[PDB]
């Protein structure tokens, strides 16, 4: 029968006109049962209603439609391992959001995705229920309840068909672990998917670096226990033979630079086929081609394998593309940090030909900045242009301010407290401002520093620092004297290369010494300065203000920051007090470390530590007694008490201000002293020379798993500190401290590893060449921050 009206009963969301035009029927047109069915199907297919029921009321079709309910709210309970924000985002990705129509069917796929996500999080046996609670006016409350069960963990990473390499030596480099000791940070046992592919790639690279050019992973099987709490990963591989490099030939479109390319691709006769070195040569060729102005050079290295002589020949196809020119660089997402803070880390210059490696270099610099959580790149094309591009960077701003509070232990520091608050991006202008504080056993330190890392476009840094430093020499195993000081320093830093840096600056420091202990060297310094205190008095007071010019040079090339294996590191610091200050002197120190590898895998290493230092007064003055060098302890030479090595203090016949019976109080007349008497209280000379030869070897008694997480070594240390300005033949009854020939030696064994509590460093030492008066310490243990 003919139709002349549609009721649209219960249509609050979809507009009446929109619903009417959605169906393929117009008013006044003949309608049959087939037409009614087609209209119902079309309306259902619109994806806006859950049920369509049409009733023929008189001559008008009463189209009763069950509308799609809107998401009143979504309630989650029991997600103790996953925050509901990520669940909300996942629901958004599927279109289910508060205030959106709930189709009652896509929610099934959403809960399937949630169950898959829970599987991905390690909760394998968990259960998910997407219950729907009806609410008036066709509303739905979506209660995504679930039970997380218990997480699964890996139980074995087994490799079959491997020879010449134990499974332990191969599963170590995996980011996926199977045995994680409590006393050593090595990672979690949670199982992932992308990590498995990464580990298989790592295995491939490890086998290909050793010459096994025919290595091929047959397959990989992951299994679950019936209890569903244990993963079992097996990797069936097939290792070939150790091949050798027959030769490498470059072919293709070299852009007329065959000579340099051939020079770069040179190999010694009969070298081992190393995939890493092959890729390094490929990237060197890419760099050479790019430097001449090719944006997208192509290098395809195919190895041809001849088993007759067990040889591999590298056919490298080179194809330099076209030339592209970067029209302009854009930065997106930097709502806080200004454009300069991001555009000065770019090694690619706008308005110049394109280099992809340069873009990735700038990307890594932006990553190392620390301000940005994620930083992606896009070499977008300029519309209506053949060879012009724009290099867009999309950054997601991260937080910068942070306050930290650490605590550590040590034999040279007792218990050490550290606290501070830092802001590495002041209002997004590059300036970094921080407040730091430390409390040692014998000193306290408060610092406020503000640095501009880019004072010149080149990269010269300019920093300022205000410090208040209190020193209690009594607690530092030294002669009794308190020193409260405060000062401010302004410095400039010049970088020469990636492995060198100069620092030059000025500083002003005001010191105040009190409670000083009458002794020969300190009184000599005071006499030289111009003050003559009374030896009898125990409570003295002195204060000075000095302006100093500081210079320094640091060269750092260590291959690995933690547990180095190869490279040098030389630091040379120095200072001279400028005219117009109470003190007149200069000082210089030079500490060197050098790790030389002896094996091929960088497992057996030799560490050549050294430390020289010398300082002296310029005119008739003397170098301050609160700035002399020190030795012994754990830092300089193991096997001695902290600060013990060096000249000892000679005390005058003084009466202590506070005295208690049976207490030495530094050879006090109260105890009965009436003449100069030598003691074991170190004072510290003004010339220091220390050296140490250490052999680093793999730790013997430990599973080959995580065997590189503990560093074990045997050390032999030599040290000597002396006072050059000690008066010659001043007294025949005491040792000639000015003599430098006296050299102390020790030998021992040291261990280090990264415990959850921090970096732990144990050492047992024996000072077989200790001289008279030196305090002997044997077991030096440090529990890092």
């Amino acid at each position: 029968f003919v139709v002349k009206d549609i009721h649209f009963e219960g249509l609050q969301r979809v507009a009446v006109g929109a619903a009417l035009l959605s169906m393929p029927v117009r008013t006044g047109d003949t309608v049959n049962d087939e037409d009614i069915s087609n209209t119902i199907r079309a309306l259902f297919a619109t994806g806006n209603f859950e049920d369509v029921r049409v009733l023929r009321d008189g001559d008008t079709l009463l189209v009763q439609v069950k509308e799609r309910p809107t998401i009143a709210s979504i309630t989650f309970s029991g997600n103790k391992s996953v925050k509901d924000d990520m669940l909300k985002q996942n629901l958004e990705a599927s279109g289910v959001r508060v205030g959106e129509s709930l189709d009652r069917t896509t929610i099934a796929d959403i809960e399937k995705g949630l169950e898959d996500f829970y599987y991905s999080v390690g909760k394998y046996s968990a259960s998910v229920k997407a219950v729907v609670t009806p609410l008036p006016r066709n509303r739905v409350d979506l209660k995504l309840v679930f039970q997380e069960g218990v997480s699964a963990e890996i139980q074995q990473i087994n490799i079959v068909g491997n020879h010449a390499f134990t499974t332990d030596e191969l599963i170590s480099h995996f980011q996926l672990r199977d045995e994680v000791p409590w006393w050593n940070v090595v990672g979690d046992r949670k199982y992932q998917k992308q990590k498995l592919a990464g580990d298989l790639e790592t295995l491939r690279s490890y086998y290909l670096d050793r010459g096994y050019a025919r290595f091929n992973i047959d397959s990989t099987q992951v299994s679950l226990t019936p209890d569903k709490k244990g993963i079992y990963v097996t990797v069936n591989i097939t290792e070939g033979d150790q091949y050798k490099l027959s030769g490498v030939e470059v072919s293709g479109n070299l852009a007329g630079h065959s000579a340099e390319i051939e020079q770069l691709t040179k190999i010694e006769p009969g070298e081992l086929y190393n995939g890493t070195k092959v890729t390094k040569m490929e990237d060197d060729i890419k760099k050479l081609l790019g430097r001449y102005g090719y944006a997208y050079p192509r290098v395809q290295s195919m190895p041809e394998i001849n088993d007759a002589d067990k040889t591999v020949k590298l056919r490298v196809n080179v194809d330099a593309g076209n030339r592209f020119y970067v029209r302009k660089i854009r930065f997106e997402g930097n709502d806080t940090s200004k454009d300069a803070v991001l555009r000065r880390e770019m090694r690619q210059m706008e308005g110049a030909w394109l280099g992809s490696d340069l873009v990735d270099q700038g990307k890594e610099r932006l990553n190392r900045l620390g301000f940005f959580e994620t930083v992606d790149t896009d070499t977008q094309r300029v519309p209506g242009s053949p060879d012009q591009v724009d290099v867009v960077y999309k950054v997601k701003e991260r937080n910068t301010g942070s306050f930290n509070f650490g605590i550590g232990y040590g034999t040279e520091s007792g218990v050490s407290f550290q606290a501070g608050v830092q802001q590495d991006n002041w209002l997004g202008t590059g300036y970094a401002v921080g407040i730091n504080g430390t409390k040692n056993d014998y000193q306290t330190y408060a610092e406020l520093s503000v640095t501009n890392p880019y004072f010149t476009v080149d990269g010269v840094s300019l920093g300022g620092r205000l410090f208040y430093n209190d020193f209690q020499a009594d607690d530092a195993d030294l002669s009794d004297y308190t020193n409260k000081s405060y000062g401010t320093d302004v410095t400039l830093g010049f970088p020469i290369n990636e492995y060198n840096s100069l620092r030059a600056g000025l500083g002003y420091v005001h010191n105040s010494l009190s409670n000083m202990q009458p002794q020969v060297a300190m009184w000599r310094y005071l006499y030289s300065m111009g003050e003559h205190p009374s030896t009898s008095d125990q409570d003295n007071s002195f204060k000075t203000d000095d302006f100093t010019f500081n210079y320094g040079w640091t060269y750092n090339k260590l291959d690995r920051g933690y547990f180095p294996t190869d490279g040098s590191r030389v630091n040379l610091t120095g200072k001279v007090t400028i005219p117009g200050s109470d003190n007149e002197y200069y000082k210089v120190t030079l500490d060197t470390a050098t790790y030389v590898p002896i094996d091929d895998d960088h497992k057996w290493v030799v560490l050549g530590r050294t430390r020289w230092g010398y300082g002296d007064g310029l005119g008739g003055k003397e170098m301050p007694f609160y700035e002399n060098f020190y030795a012994g302890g754990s830092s300089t030479v193991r096997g001695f008490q902290s600060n013990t090595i060096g000249p000892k203090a000679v005390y005058f016949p003084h009466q202590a201000s506070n005295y208690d019976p049976d207490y030495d109080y530094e050879c006090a007349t109260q105890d009965g002293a009436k003449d100069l008497c030598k003691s074991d209280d170190a004072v510290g000379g003004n010339a220091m020379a220390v050296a140490s030869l250490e052999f680093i070897t793999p730790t013997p008694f430990i599973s080959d798993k995580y065997a590189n997480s503990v560093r074990t070594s045997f050390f032999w240390d030599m040290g000597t500190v002396w006072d050059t300005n000690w008066d010659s033949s001043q007294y025949s009854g005491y040792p000639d401290y000015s003599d430098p020939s006296n050299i102390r030696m020790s030998a021992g064994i040291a261990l280090q590893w990264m415990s959850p509590l921090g970096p732990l460093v144990f050492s047992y030492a024996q000072p077989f060449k200790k001289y008279d008066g030196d305090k002997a310490e044997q077991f030096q243990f440090n529990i890092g921050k």
Partner: peptide, 7 residues
């Protein structure tokens, strides 16, 4: 031990 909290 050392604890940092990026506020």
């Amino acid at each position: 031990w050392n604890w940092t909290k990026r506020f």
